[PDB]
Every structure is written in structure tokens, then in C-alpha cells.
Design a protein around this ligand. Structure first.
Ligand SMILES: O=C(c1ccc2c(c1)OCO2)N1CCCCCC1
Length: 185
């Protein structure tokens, strides 16, 4: 692709984080801790899942950023509405305000309803995310495989400001402790 010139500097918003996440001092990395990270509860925090939002809000233009997923067994990435549900159980779908892909149990899926199988020959270590607000497009790229297309959501109905969206996943296995990292420009 040729989206790199719309690069934006994303930082994580600690106030949205599940109370078990550890966000680095530079707000560019997040991982699972061993326990409750000693923060107060608030209505922004994702309660059921190890999710966090970027601080930036987007309502126009073209935006691009990259995320490192090296050695993780499970994660979700993409964008979501600023007004998504934070508490209780929910599915990642456009109907619920999410435009995401994920890894789970050695398969990659797009968060459509129902979910769509992705065809990835080279397991990605870094994912590029492109948003075109006006066109209603969210696209995912495999940076490990020369930027090859993973998935495009088109005809998106954003219906509000968008925030970068992250899920570090469960670590029931002991094999998914590695962080998500926002890669330098
Ligand atoms: O992966 C998780 C986990 C993370 C966030 C959660 C959660 C579970 O439920 C609500 O938000 N853990 C922690 C507890 C069990 C042992 C390790 C796995």
C-alpha cells in the first residue's frame, strides 16, 4: 500500500483500560498484569475483557498506524465508536460500533456478524490499520508480508467519532503475556 504518509502518533488512554492492564510510561505499550493494577473504577473502563482505547478521536480524514503483535496467541485490533458499551458482555461487530480483526486459536477472523475467515499465509508480527472517515473504509495490512492486504471493511457507518481499539487478550495459557506495542513512524 501507499498509506504510510497518513501516519498518526497514537497513545493509549489509561482511564479506558480494564483494571488489570499495565500501560507503559510513554503510553505506547500495554500488557496483562498478574492482578488488579490498583486503580479506581470508572464508567469508561472495559469490565469484562482486557481492552483499552487510544486517546485520539477521529471524525474526518485519513489515518494510519501500526501495532506489534509479536509472540501473542490472542488479540483484537481496529477502531470503534467513542460511545461503545464498556460494561458487560458484547460481540465485536459493526452493529455494536466496532471495526476489528483478531487472532484466536491459530485462526485470524474479521469482526463481522457473523465473523469472516481471513486467509493469512505469513503470520503477522506487525499490523497496519488504515481509516478513511469520509469514504467509510477500515483496512488492515500485514507489515511482515510486504504490506499485503488482510481485510477491508467498506460502506462503514461510523455514526460518531472513532477511537483506536485494542484487546491484549486472555492469558489463561501462560503463552499470551506479550504486549501490544504502537510502532514508531
Ligand atoms: O486473561 C485473564 C483475564 C484478563 C482480563 C479479564 C479477565 C480475565 O476477566 C475479566 O477481565 N486472566 C486473569 C484471570 C485468570 C488467570 C489468567 C488470565
Amino acid at each position: 500500500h501507499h498509506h504510510h504518509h497518513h501516519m498518526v502518533h497514537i497513545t493509549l488512554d489509561r482511564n479506558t483500560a480494564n483494571s488489570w492492564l499495565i500501560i507503559s510510561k510513554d503510553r505506547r505499550q500495554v500488557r496483562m498484569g498478574d492482578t488488579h493494577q490498583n486503580v479506581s473504577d470508572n464508567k469508561e473502563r472495559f469490565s469484562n475483557y482486557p481492552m483499552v482505547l487510544g486517546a485520539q478521536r477521529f471524525s474526518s480524514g485519513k489515518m494510519y498506524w501500526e501495532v506489534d503483535v509479536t509472540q501473542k496467541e490472542a488479540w483484537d485490533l481496529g477502531v470503534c465508536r467513542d460511545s461503545v458499551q464498556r460494561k458487560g458482555q458484547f460481540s465485536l461487530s459493526p452493529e455494536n460500533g466496532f471495526w476489528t480483526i483478531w487472532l484466536w486459536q491459530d485462526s485470524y477472523e474479521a469482526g463481522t456478524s457473523p465473523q469472516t475467515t481471513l486467509h493469512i499465509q505469513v503470520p503477522p508480527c506487525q499490523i497496519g490499520i488504515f481509516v478513511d472517515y469520509e469514504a467509510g473504509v477500515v483496512s488492515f495490512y500485514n507489515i511482515t508480508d510486504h504490506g499485503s492486504l488482510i481485510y477491508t471493511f467498506s460502506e462503514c457507518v461510523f455514526a460518531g467519532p472513532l477511537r483506536p481499539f485494542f484487546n491484549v487478550g486472555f492469558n489463561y495459557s501462560g503463552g499470551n503475556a506479550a504486549p501490544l506495542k504502537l510502532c514508531p513512524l
